[PDB]
Amino acid sequence: SGLVPRGSHMDLEELEEDLKQALREGRKVNILGIEVTTEEQARRLIEFLRRFI
Amino acid sequence: SGLVPRGSHMDLEELEEDLKQALREGRKVNILGIEVTTEEQARRLIEFLRRFI
Numbered sequence: 001s002g003l004v005p006r007g008s009h010m011d012l013e014e015l016e017e018d019l020k021q022a023l024r025e026g027r028k029v030n031i032l033g034i035e036v037t038t039e040e041q042a043r044r045l046i047e048f049l050r051r052f053i
Numbered sequence: 054s055g056l057v058p059r060g061s062h063m064d065l066e067e068l069e070e071d072l073k074q075a076l077r078e079g080r081k082v083n084i085l086g087i088e089v090t091t092e093e094q095a096r097r098l099i100e101f102l103r104r105f106i
Contacts, residue, residue, distance in 0.1 A: 012106070015085050032084040032102065033063035049085060053065075053103045 016046055069099050 004021055007014040019029040019042050029036040032049065036042045059071065072082045072095055082089035082098060089098045 010086060018086060030083040033058075033068070050106050053105060 012046075012050055015049070016042075019045070065103070068102075069095075072098065 004017065007017050019031070019036060020039070022029045023036070023039050023042060029042065029045075031045060032052075034041070034045060036045050059067065063071070072089060073092065075082055076089070076092050076095060082095065084098065084102075087094075087098060087101075089095050
């Protein structure tokens with residue numbers, strides 16, 4: 001009933017809101033060497049990638 | 054016998070040779086909000102993630 005029209009374009013919170021929306025419709029996320037099926041893995045992913053280079 | 058992608062790990066130099074391997078065998082790199090289908094996008098992706106925060 002309400003599509004999110006993207007956060008901005010590309011940002012840290014862009015990623016977080018995008019992967020959240022996938023989990024909020026009950027579906028997984030495909031990212032760098034990782035597949036997030038739960039928000040457990042999503043919050044671990046976020047703290048990982050903002051520290052990973 | 055590489056029955057599973059890099060066993061259960063993903064190193065940085067290993068990621069580069071692995072994503073090049075993917076593009077050279079006919080695959081793409083599905084990372085955070087980005088899909089690398091060319092080695093143009095691959096050199097962009099490597100320098101991106103090592104710069105990303």
